[PDB]
Ligand binder design. Structure first.
Ligand SMILES: *CCC(=O)Nc1cccc(Nc2nc(Nc3ccc(OCCOC)cc3)ncc2F)c1
Ligand SMILES: O=C(Nc1nccs1)[C@@H](c1ccccc1)N1Cc2ccccc2C1=O
Ligand SMILES: [Cl-]
Length: 266
């Protein structure tokens, strides 16, 4: 347990290049140089903006994020605590899945898309088995280790357009509210990275959902696939599919991909 999270010294890692920066902090590509070893490991390093307060909460959560053990869930490798918090995990060389499907929209076939749906459902099922609620599942929070190996990140940390109605209205987050976000994530993949409810203010989302409107059927999706997405967006959270059922359904479709997704040049 405790040995799953490495407490790193500033000597043990070096930031080499900027991968991205934003309100959250800065993510770097860098090297992990563990003391007493003769290897330099390429990693991603995230430096959080300085916290005013306490610091214990960040460390407590870090121990949890270091304990995950699933091929489709990112694991926290190490942490360095100074004036700032610095977080180290394996580099995902291909970036986030949302950008990946946008950049390769013309070269992605039905098998890739359905395999991603399986892998994301497997990671979410694992998090549910560990009693962890993600709360922020979106295509931007799936990272691409290799084109057919993706991993969920940033679980346990307002994304109105991905939230289930009960989360918007009542601040209720459960595994079933994650299923709703899974449905939106699948919609992003099937539209090759379109923005959900594009051009609609976030403040209007609750009313259009209350009105019974949902994201439209993607052109490539047959009715069998769209019906699964639609069930993820049922108002009754108990009526949504469970991640265990989604694994089975998408695994079945991945066995015959061309039957379930209609893509030009597939
Ligand atoms: C879709 C949202 C998004 O872009 N997330 C993001 C951005 C920057 C860094 C991370 N965290 C992270 N990143 C990687 N790998 C990686 C590789 C290439 C990248 O840039 C591609 C375009 O630039 C030319 C960015 C990130 N690995 C592990 C990580 F935690 C996430
Ligand atoms: O570290 C993460 N992402 C990275 N990107 C590049 C290097 S680290 C991310 C994460 C990692 C793995 C699983 C879930 C979340 N964390 C952890 C964590 C613990 C405490 C406070 C904040 C965070 C946070 O944002
Ligand atoms: Cl976007």
């Amino acid at each position: 347990n405790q040995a799953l999270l490495r407490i790193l010294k500033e000597t043990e890692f070096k930031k080499i290049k900027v991968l991205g920066s934003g309100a959250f902090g800065t993510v770097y590509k860098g090297l992990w140089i563990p003391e007493g070893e003769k290897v330099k490991i390429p990693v991603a390093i995230k430096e959080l903006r300085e916290a005013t307060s306490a610091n214990k909460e960040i460390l407590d959560e870090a121990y949890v994020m270091a304990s995950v053990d699933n091929p489709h869930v990112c694991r926290l490798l190490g942490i360095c605590l100074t004036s700032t918090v610095q977080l180290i995990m394996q580099l995902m060389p291909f970036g986030c899945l949302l950008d990946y499907v946008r950049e390769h929209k013309d070269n992605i076939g039905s098998q890739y898309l359905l395999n991603w749906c399986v892998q994301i459902a497997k990671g979410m099922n694992y998090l549910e088995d560990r009693r962890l609620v993600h709360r922020d599942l979106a295509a931007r929070n799936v990272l691409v280790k290799t084109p057919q190996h993706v991993k969920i990140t940033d679980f346990g940390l307002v994304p109105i357009k991905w939230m289930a109605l009960e989360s918007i209205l009542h601040r209720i987050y459960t595994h079933q509210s994650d299923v709703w976000s899974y449905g939106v994530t699948v919609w992003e993949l099937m539209t090759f990275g379109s923005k959900p409810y594009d051009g609609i203010p976030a403040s209007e989302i609750s009313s259009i959902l209350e009105k019974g409107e949902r994201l439209p059927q993607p052109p490539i999706c047959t009715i069998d696939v769209y019906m699964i997405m639609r069930k993820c967006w049922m108002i009754d959270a108990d009526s949504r599919p469970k991640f265990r059922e989604l694994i089975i359904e998408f695994s079945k479709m991945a066995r015959d991909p061309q039957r379930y997704l209609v893509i030009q040049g597939d």
